[PDB]
PDB file of C-alpha atoms in Angstrom:
ATOM      1  CA  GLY A   1       6.911   1.117   6.704  1.00  0.00           C
ATOM      2  CA  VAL A   2       6.062   3.206   3.825  1.00  0.00           C
ATOM      3  CA  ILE A   3       2.784   4.488   3.977  1.00  0.00           C
ATOM      4  CA  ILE A   4       2.182   7.202   1.638  1.00  0.00           C
ATOM      5  CA  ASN A   5      -1.180   9.340   1.155  1.00  0.00           C
ATOM      6  CA  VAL A   6      -2.514   7.889  -2.104  1.00  0.00           C
ATOM      7  CA  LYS A   7      -6.433   7.723  -1.916  1.00  0.00           C
ATOM      8  CA  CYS A   8      -6.960   3.622  -0.745  1.00  0.00           C
ATOM      9  CA  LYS A   9     -10.174   3.125  -2.541  1.00  0.00           C
ATOM     10  CA  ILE A  10      -8.703  -0.361  -2.795  1.00  0.00           C
ATOM     11  CA  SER A  11      -5.149  -1.773  -1.357  1.00  0.00           C
ATOM     12  CA  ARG A  12      -4.598  -3.383  -4.085  1.00  0.00           C
ATOM     13  CA  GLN A  13      -4.230  -0.826  -6.184  1.00  0.00           C
ATOM     14  CA  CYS A  14      -1.693   0.471  -3.341  1.00  0.00           C
ATOM     15  CA  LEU A  15       0.399  -2.971  -3.050  1.00  0.00           C
ATOM     16  CA  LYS A  16       0.614  -3.438  -7.353  1.00  0.00           C
ATOM     17  CA  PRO A  17       3.077   0.254  -6.293  1.00  0.00           C
ATOM     18  CA  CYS A  18       4.340  -1.143  -3.390  1.00  0.00           C
ATOM     19  CA  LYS A  19       5.452  -4.879  -4.221  1.00  0.00           C
ATOM     20  CA  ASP A  20       7.028  -3.062  -7.192  1.00  0.00           C
ATOM     21  CA  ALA A  21       9.377  -1.208  -5.369  1.00  0.00           C
ATOM     22  CA  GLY A  22       9.767  -2.997  -2.810  1.00  0.00           C
ATOM     23  CA  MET A  23       6.856  -3.434  -0.022  1.00  0.00           C
ATOM     24  CA  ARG A  24       5.341  -7.542   0.395  1.00  0.00           C
ATOM     25  CA  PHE A  25       2.471  -5.986   1.972  1.00  0.00           C
ATOM     26  CA  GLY A  26       0.259  -2.862   0.812  1.00  0.00           C
ATOM     27  CA  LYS A  27      -3.000  -2.463   3.587  1.00  0.00           C
ATOM     28  CA  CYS A  28      -5.565  -0.237   2.831  1.00  0.00           C
ATOM     29  CA  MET A  29      -5.828   2.016   6.730  1.00  0.00           C
ATOM     30  CA  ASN A  30      -7.341   5.210   7.733  1.00  0.00           C
ATOM     31  CA  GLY A  31      -6.687   6.603   4.356  1.00  0.00           C
ATOM     32  CA  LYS A  32      -3.716   6.185   3.356  1.00  0.00           C
ATOM     33  CA  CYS A  33      -1.865   2.439   1.659  1.00  0.00           C
ATOM     34  CA  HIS A  34      -0.009   0.716   3.855  1.00  0.00           C
ATOM     35  CA  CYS A  35       2.999  -0.001   2.351  1.00  0.00           C
ATOM     36  CA  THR A  36       5.164  -3.068   4.757  1.00  0.00           C
ATOM     37  CA  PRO A  37       8.681  -3.487   2.335  1.00  0.00           C
ATOM     38  CA  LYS A  38       9.268  -6.406   0.870  1.00  0.00           C
TER      39      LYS A  38
END
């Protein structure tokens, strides 16, 4: 999946730009934003 090395203080901060790009999921994991494609 498309994992971004952005500090996920919260999953919503990752998912917002991810689902807008084409990531149906966006979960904060180990410090990275795990954005699974739409």
